Structure 1
Amino acid sequence: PKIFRKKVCTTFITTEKPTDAYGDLDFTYSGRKHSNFLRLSDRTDPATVYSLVTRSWGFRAPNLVVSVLGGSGGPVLQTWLQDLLRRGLVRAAQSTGAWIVTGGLHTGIGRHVGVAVRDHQTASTGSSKVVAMGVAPWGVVRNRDMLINPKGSFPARYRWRGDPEDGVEFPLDYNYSAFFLVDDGTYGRLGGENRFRLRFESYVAQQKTGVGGTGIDIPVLLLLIDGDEKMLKRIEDATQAQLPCLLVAGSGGAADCLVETLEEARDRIRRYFPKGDPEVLQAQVERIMTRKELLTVYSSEDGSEEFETIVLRALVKACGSSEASAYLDELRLAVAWNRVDIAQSELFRGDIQWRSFHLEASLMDALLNDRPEFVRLLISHGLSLGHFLTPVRLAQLYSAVSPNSLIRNLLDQASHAPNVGQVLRTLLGETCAPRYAPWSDLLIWALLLNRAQMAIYFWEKGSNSVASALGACLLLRVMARLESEAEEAARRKDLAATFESMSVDLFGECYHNSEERAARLLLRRCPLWGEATCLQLAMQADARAFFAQDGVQSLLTQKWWGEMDSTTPIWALLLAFFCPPLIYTNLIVFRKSKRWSDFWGAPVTAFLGNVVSYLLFLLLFAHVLLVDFQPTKPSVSELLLYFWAFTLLCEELRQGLGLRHRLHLYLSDTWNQCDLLALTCFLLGVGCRLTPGLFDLGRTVLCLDFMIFTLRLLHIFTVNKQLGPKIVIVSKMMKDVFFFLFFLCVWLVAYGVATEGILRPQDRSLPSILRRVFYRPYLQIFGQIPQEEMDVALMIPGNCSMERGSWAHPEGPVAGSCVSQYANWLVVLLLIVFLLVANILLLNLLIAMFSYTFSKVHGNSDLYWKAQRYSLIREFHSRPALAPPLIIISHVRLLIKWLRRLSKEAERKLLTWESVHKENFLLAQARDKRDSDSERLKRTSQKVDTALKQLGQIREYDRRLRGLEREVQHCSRVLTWMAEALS
């Protein structure tokens, strides 16, 4: 790796040897980031050098390469050209993402370049550096002696700013992110670097823009400043290899070539810019006219962002053969540079009649890279996706996947058995999984690769909107759990909350138009998501804000009542319940063998029959356990009770089976552990009861079992509207209760043992002490205060102890037979302190904590109840429709059944109605963003900047024009004086 840099690079002294100087170079006593570094020999292959840059160091690919030449004016350049470098070239390389190849020294042009890059990093916050790459020959290096050690990634403390000597050795500029020190073996001459310089820039011109290539080639430009004769030989050596260029109007050979293109005397123009050797250089002007088309003029039009448009027109003029491929290059490069403001305003004015595949290739370049703005811009020009999404292109869309991503691992596990439908199946299951019309495939594409505005745009253009939004939130939150990195896990949960909010708003407007039609919208199998209803998707995705609306709750009410009227009071339902021939009357409005079946088919009457049958079970269990509980042989009613508990064991077995995973979900719960506990204690009770030696144990265990069967009845009533959410908030108070018991039990030990100690009772059994320490001070909280058990003044004295001291005799069998009188006032004073702390501090601080917790929790408990309420109604729908004394005939029916083994046009009218309300909602939201104050402040700031651009033109251009009219009027008066000379 780091040894590999030596093993490839061999340097010649020609005696060739593998190198040693590969550097994690940085600068002493300065803030620059460490610069990657390698000494390299000439005549080498640029393939492995580019692989060094983009893999071993790791740089992104250029979207543009500009290599700057010059160096005639030595120490100080003109500030007009400094403005051209700083605000023409460096902010262009900041915007497009580009490379600047210059000499990496502090001499010549690289001094002014590094001043320009550092000055631009001052006054710009774009959060990305400007990749400046510098080449320099090994011989002219000042301090190359500190670059020897073959260790690896070493900080070589490179001493800049020291040893000032002129002419011979030059230091390095600290404004470059990489350095390529060309080894010539010459050690002091100017350098034969032009060969590998041209091979490197030609090889970058070979390569393709993009992730896996698949774009146009990286455009390479040259920028010339004044220079020397060797610069002109560098020009013609460059343009022989098809590399375009651009000129300044400073002086020197640049202005020489400008007047050469604005038109013996041409030999004469040669005779004063270098002052030497005219005719060989005249043959190089001949070679200038051999190319004649790779030469552009900058000075005619100057501006801030005019520079990039001049670069594109320098690629239009230097295309060669085809104009159609030239505009194809210009569109795909405007996408590659990620600059809409050029492409919209220069390539879609209507001058060029664009064909279809010219747009489709650019759209593929815009989909493989991440440009939402160009995707919207290219679809807006009348393109059809029915010819676009070839399965070749769709496989190419899943090709550009990051190496350390999640979908890379998931697709490689789908290649174990591309295969996108299996990745959806394994993430989501048999239901809720799509199969494999264009907009649905692009939406699933954008979600699987985690792209934000791509997914929002593809949701806005597609159809079947509400189920696709809830299914989007489902897929995003599943991947958010199955994620490694916290930044991308946070990114998926935020984009999931965006899709949940859009389904809420859309279903809002579809509900405000109609209720019955929106009811047909939700309760429908979406054929893209495995024919799962929208409520099922919002259930699995934990979309709590979707269920917590108003319309969804009213439709859950209508599904609850079923066929009946949803406004039917409870008393009419009960009177219809106990009189089965009162159904066929004018009491309950229906239609919101058939009328009988649509009274008892609702989930309400199944719930009500479940309650009434369960209450009769408790009434029977009490009649057995209180009246007729016989010691030898069970009676009739106890046997009927045994048959009932057998049926409850069967229906629990039907929801336990209804296979290790089902029982793992069955044991993970709490109220199925409760209902399991009631039947373990039941069989323990009966199993002890029929044995002859354990009658009392069986009767006691049955009496403890009745409480568990009674506490089940709180969980049954959580489906009700009025009593529902309050039963939810009961369990969230137990942390305050457990604090109360901690503070109580500490203080109850302290008061108890101190009062039991100051008194000295004579009856000293162990359980009598435990009663007088823990049980009696517990009842003093609830107003049970025995004064006669613990105060001598309410007692009679007596000689009740054969011991020294005073003794007295209290009232009560368990109060101790004889108690002490010494220091009794401290016992009375402990009784006052105990009633103060317990009955005032602890109880009233508990009321304050229940008030605080209740107002803190009440919002989330209402949201959580409204989310779970669908599951409660649905599980009352999938029940045997008989009572628990009559369910066994349906369990046997289920057992012998085990032993034998909308329209289309209403759907189309529904989905068009949905899409209309979608389009009105998006138009309303767009007007609400645009007409705000901050957006209006942005538009006004653009307008004032436009007016500043307009005033600047008339300030200078009228000054020349006023001079021009003054230039005529100056001689017109003298000619009038020459007419007066004729007078």
Structure 2
Amino acid sequence: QAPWSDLLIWALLLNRAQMAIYFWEKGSNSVASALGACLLLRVMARLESEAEEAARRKDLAATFESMSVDLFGECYHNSEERAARLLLRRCPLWGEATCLQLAMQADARAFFAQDGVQSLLTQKWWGEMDSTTPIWALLLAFFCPPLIYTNLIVFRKSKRWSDFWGAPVTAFLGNVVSYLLFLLLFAHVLLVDFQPTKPSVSELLLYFWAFTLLCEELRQGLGLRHRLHLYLSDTWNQCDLLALTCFLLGVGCRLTPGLFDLGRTVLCLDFMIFTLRLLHIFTVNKQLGPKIVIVSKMMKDVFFFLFFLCVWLVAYGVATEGILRPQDRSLPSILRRVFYRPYLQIFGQIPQEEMDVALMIPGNCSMERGSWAHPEGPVAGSCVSQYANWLVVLLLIVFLLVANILLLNLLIAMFSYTFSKVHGNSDLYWKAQRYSLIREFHSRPALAPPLIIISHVRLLIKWLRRLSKEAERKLLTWESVHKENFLLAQARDKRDSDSERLKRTSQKVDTALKQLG
């Protein structure tokens, strides 16, 4: 009969700070109850009307988060294997949700930033192999399936067969190899054999593969209207939806006889969308991961660059086009030599023979008053005015100064500031997301997406037909031992601080004056 959890839930719902901390320190099952307290307080703080009381609830939820961090830090510092059984324990509080899922739902990013939690996610990622095996041994065992039964891959953190092919690293590695073979087949169809009359054998293999990828995205979109709200929420579910919609528009346009070239180009832009998927597939990796995350935070500085450049590119381009007006005055021709010459001049392509009379041969080539010169090039105009050409050379010099020295070196300065400012928060965000990415590979039907139709048939058939108790007591008493040592050391550190020594001296001198008088 331990009713301490009823008084904990009572003190959390009425927002009593000192009550809820005391009721935490007396009850058991402490790591899960601190994550449950942090979750419940943040849910009720978003639902709060008064601003001061929502601020009060977010301060208390931050206190419970730091206590679960400090307690699990000491439980991990004693024994790694036993603390691993402490996090991964089924349904400690309020339904089947482990401590990692309570840390995920509460947005407790300081709990995932520990070295103990990241070590347990590394052990979970490698399955039932050892987490120190190098990646080349994983590659040699992957491309040689009989080489599993040797002394390269040490196990224990037809049995070794499902110890190799059951780990999340080999579901990842099989997914990457199958996705690169999809791109290699896509490129072979698009660059070598794309017949105008009838689709060949290799293109029908491509259409079959894209049907398997479509059924995979409906399986992650259904396996029901709130689930569609969740699939519409992400940006990369929308991007894989975007790749498949451009694919259907390309194949549907190709099959009509009057629209061959339109589908021929829509599939090329579709190839770019499928290859940018690979930036999201490798966010699970330990070295490439966090750096891919920081790239999307560097895009407000690129947009300042494009703003300042487009103001300056219009100013330079229309001025030099007006100064030496040419004789080919088509609309796309002048849009070429207004926007597209100066954009390539900031990358080192400076055409001097198109806009400088000293490099051109003169002549009476126009039908108008004035002196004219004949440029070289099929797009540079046909005759160019010679009046005030030193001003065109000065506008080139000023353009190269402002574009290549101000804007490029200032952009390097802004990228350096933004990077050193957001780098720490991007590490904290990546570790918290690293749990749910691993859980995605562990929850996937482990069969490669060219051959994944087998598992979708089996799930279609199933859709047509519709610790021990003493081990938990030993575990929780072990946790309560370390909770008491944590709280005693916290009390000794507060008592030996300098300000409470100053309080205790002040009260002793005050009672000394009470003894004299």
| TM-score, scaled to structure 1 | 0.52
Contact 1:760 1:819 in 2 (8 A): yes
Residue 920 of structure 1: how far off its partner (Å) = 0.2
Q: Which residue of 2 aligns with 1:714?
A: 279
Tell me the distance in 1 between the aligned counterparts of 2:172 and 2:363.
68
The question of 1:478 aligning with 2:53 is answered no
Q: Which residue of 2 aligns with 1:16?
A: none
The question of 1:672 aligning with 2:220 is answered no
Determine helix, strand or coil for the equivalent of 2:388.
Answer: coil
Q: Deviations over 1:817-853 (max 9, x none)?
A: 0000000000000000000000000000000000000
**Ranges in structure 2 where 5+ consecutive residues have no aligned partner:** none
Residue 594 of structure 1: how far off its partner (Å) = 1.2
Determine helix, strand or coil for the equivalent of 1:897.
Answer: helix
Residue 760 of structure 1: how far off its partner (Å) = 1.2
Tell me the distance in 2 between the aligned counterparts of 1:442 and 1:717.
46
Contact 2:221 2:227 in 1 (8 A): yes
Contact 2:495 2:501 in 1 (8 A): yes
Residue 899 of structure 1: how far off its partner (Å) = 1.1
The question of 1:529 aligning with 2:94 is answered yes
Tell me the distance in 2 between the aligned counterparts of 1:636 and 1:526.
52
Residue 906 of structure 1: how far off its partner (Å) = 1.1
Determine helix, strand or coil for the equivalent of 1:680.
Answer: helix
Contact 2:92 2:98 in 1 (8 A): no
Tell me the distance in 2 between the aligned counterparts of 1:783 and 1:933.
66
**Ranges in structure 1 where 5+ consecutive residues have no aligned partner:** 1-436, 952-982
Contact 1:800 1:808 in 2 (8 A): yes
Contact 1:467 1:526 in 2 (8 A): no
Determine helix, strand or coil for the equivalent of 1:808.
Answer: strand
Tell me the distance in 1 between the aligned counterparts of 2:92 and 2:63.
24
Greater relative contact order: 1 or 2 (C-alpha under 8 angstroms, separation 6 or more)?
2
Contact 2:4 2:27 in 1 (8 A): yes
Residue 904 of structure 1: how far off its partner (Å) = 1.2
Determine helix, strand or coil for the equivalent of 1:593.
Answer: coil
Q: Deviations over 1:620-652 (max 9, x none)?
A: 000000000000100000000000000000000
Tell me the distance in 2 between the aligned counterparts of 1:546 and 1:692.
60
Tell me the distance in 2 between the aligned counterparts of 1:540 and 1:593.
38
Q: Deviations over 1:355-398 (max 9, x none)?
A: xxxxxxxxxxxxxxxxxxxxxxxxxxxxxxxxxxxxxxxxxxxx
Q: Which residue of 2 aligns with 1:752?
A: 317
Q: Which residue of 1 aligns with 2:474?
A: 909
| Alignment equivalent of 2:136, drawn from 561, 564, 571 | 571
Q: Deviations over 1:956-983 (max 9, x none)?
A: xxxxxxxxxxxxxxxxxxxxxxxxxxx9
Q: How does 1:198-213 map to 2 (within 5 A)?
A: none
Q: Deviations over 1:400-420 (max 9, x none)?
A: xxxxxxxxxxxxxxxxxxxxx
Residue 532 of structure 1: how far off its partner (Å) = 1.2
Tell me the distance in 2 between the aligned counterparts of 1:452 and 1:680.
53
Bigger Rg over Cα = 1
Tell me the distance in 2 between the aligned counterparts of 1:528 and 1:870.
20
Tell me the distance in 2 between the aligned counterparts of 1:554 and 1:849.
35
| Alignment equivalent of 1:626, drawn from 182, 185, 191 | 191
Residue 910 of structure 1: how far off its partner (Å) = 0.6
Q: How does 1:546-585 map to 2 (within 5 A)?
A: 546-585=111-150
Residue 498 of structure 1: how far off its partner (Å) = 0.2
Tell me the distance in 1 between the aligned counterparts of 2:224 and 2:134.
43
Residue 525 of structure 1: how far off its partner (Å) = 1.7
Contact 2:213 2:449 in 1 (8 A): yes
Identity of aligned residues (%): 100
Residue 938 of structure 1: how far off its partner (Å) = 0.7
Contact 1:761 1:819 in 2 (8 A): yes
Q: How does 1:266-345 map to 2 (within 5 A)?
A: none
Q: Deviations over 1:682-725 (max 9, x none)?
A: 00000000000000000000000000000011000000000000
Tell me the distance in 1 between the aligned counterparts of 2:80 and 2:93.
24
Tell me the distance in 2 between the aligned counterparts of 1:893 and 1:866.
35
Tell me the distance in 1 between the aligned counterparts of 2:96 and 2:398.
69
Contact 1:469 1:499 in 2 (8 A): yes
Contact 1:476 1:492 in 2 (8 A): yes
Q: Deviations over 1:539-592 (max 9, x none)?
A: 000000000110000000000001000000000000000000000111100012
Q: Deviations over 1:252-272 (max 9, x none)?
A: xxxxxxxxxxxxxxxxxxxxx
Structure with the higher fraction of residues in strand conformation? 1
Residue 593 of structure 1: how far off its partner (Å) = 1.9
Tell me the distance in 2 between the aligned counterparts of 1:532 and 1:744.
52
Determine helix, strand or coil for the equivalent of 2:161.
Answer: coil
Tell me the C-alpha RMSD between the 2 structures: 2.1
Determine helix, strand or coil for the equivalent of 1:468.
Answer: helix
Quick one: structure 1 residues 583 and 805, their matched pair in 2 at CA, closer, same or farther if it must change by over 3 Å? same
Residue 527 of structure 1: how far off its partner (Å) = 3.7
Contact 2:89 2:98 in 1 (8 A): yes
Determine helix, strand or coil for the equivalent of 1:693.
Answer: helix
Contact 1:717 1:724 in 2 (8 A): yes
Tell me the distance in 2 between the aligned counterparts of 1:680 and 1:528.
43
The question of 1:738 aligning with 2:331 is answered no
Residue 790 of structure 1: how far off its partner (Å) = 0.4
Residue 529 of structure 1: how far off its partner (Å) = 2.4
Q: Which residue of 2 aligns with 1:848?
A: 413
Contact 2:222 2:228 in 1 (8 A): yes
Q: Deviations over 1:792-822 (max 9, x none)?
A: 0011001110110000000000000000000
Tell me the distance in 2 between the aligned counterparts of 1:459 and 1:643.
57
Tell me the distance in 1 between the aligned counterparts of 2:134 and 2:492.
46
Tell me the distance in 1 between the aligned counterparts of 2:234 and 2:471.
42
Q: Deviations over 1:210-233 (max 9, x none)?
A: xxxxxxxxxxxxxxxxxxxxxxxx
Residue 486 of structure 1: how far off its partner (Å) = 0.2
Tell me the distance in 1 between the aligned counterparts of 2:438 and 2:295.
21
Q: How does 1:328-407 map to 2 (within 5 A)?
A: none
Contact 1:621 1:641 in 2 (8 A): yes
Tell me the distance in 2 between the aligned counterparts of 1:625 and 1:815.
35
Q: Deviations over 1:587-626 (max 9, x none)?
A: 1000122110110000000000000000000000000000
Q: Deviations over 1:280-328 (max 9, x none)?
A: xxxxxxxxxxxxxxxxxxxxxxxxxxxxxxxxxxxxxxxxxxxxxxxxx
Quick one: structure 1 residues 856 and 527, their matched pair in 2 at CA, closer, same or farther if it must change by over 3 Å? closer
State how many pairs are aligned: 516
The question of 1:918 aligning with 2:483 is answered yes
Residue 659 of structure 1: how far off its partner (Å) = 1.0
Residue 658 of structure 1: how far off its partner (Å) = 2.3
Determine helix, strand or coil for the equivalent of 1:597.
Answer: helix
Determine helix, strand or coil for the equivalent of 1:797.
Answer: strand
Tell me the distance in 1 between the aligned counterparts of 2:492 and 2:287.
42
Tell me the distance in 1 between the aligned counterparts of 2:356 and 2:492.
83
Contact 1:510 1:518 in 2 (8 A): yes
| Alignment equivalent of 2:251, drawn from 686, 690, 701 | 686
Tell me the distance in 2 between the aligned counterparts of 1:947 and 1:718.
67
Quick one: structure 1 residues 884 and 912, their matched pair in 2 at CA, closer, same or farther if it must change by over 3 Å? same
Tell me the distance in 2 between the aligned counterparts of 1:773 and 1:760.
12
Residue 531 of structure 1: how far off its partner (Å) = 2.9
Q: Which residue of 2 aligns with 1:495?
A: 60
Tell me the distance in 1 between the aligned counterparts of 2:158 and 2:386.
86
Determine helix, strand or coil for the equivalent of 1:598.
Answer: helix
| Alignment equivalent of 1:644, drawn from 188, 209, 213 | 209
Q: Deviations over 1:711-741 (max 9, x none)?
A: 0110000000000000000000000000000
Q: Deviations over 1:856-902 (max 9, x none)?
A: 00000000000100010001111011000111110010000111221
Determine helix, strand or coil for the equivalent of 2:373.
Answer: strand
Structure with the higher fraction of residues in helix conformation? 2
The question of 1:658 aligning with 2:212 is answered no
Tell me the distance in 2 between the aligned counterparts of 1:827 and 1:547.
60
Tell me the distance in 1 between the aligned counterparts of 2:76 and 2:487.
16
Tell me the distance in 1 between the aligned counterparts of 2:171 and 2:96.
27
Q: Which residue of 2 aligns with 1:249?
A: none
Contact 2:109 2:428 in 1 (8 A): yes
Contact 2:129 2:155 in 1 (8 A): yes
Residue 526 of structure 1: how far off its partner (Å) = 3.5
Q: Deviations over 1:188-245 (max 9, x none)?
A: xxxxxxxxxxxxxxxxxxxxxxxxxxxxxxxxxxxxxxxxxxxxxxxxxxxxxxxxxx
Q: How does 1:608-627 map to 2 (within 5 A)?
A: 608-627=173-192
Contact 2:32 2:92 in 1 (8 A): no
Q: Deviations over 1:465-515 (max 9, x none)?
A: 000000000000000001111010000000000000000000000011010
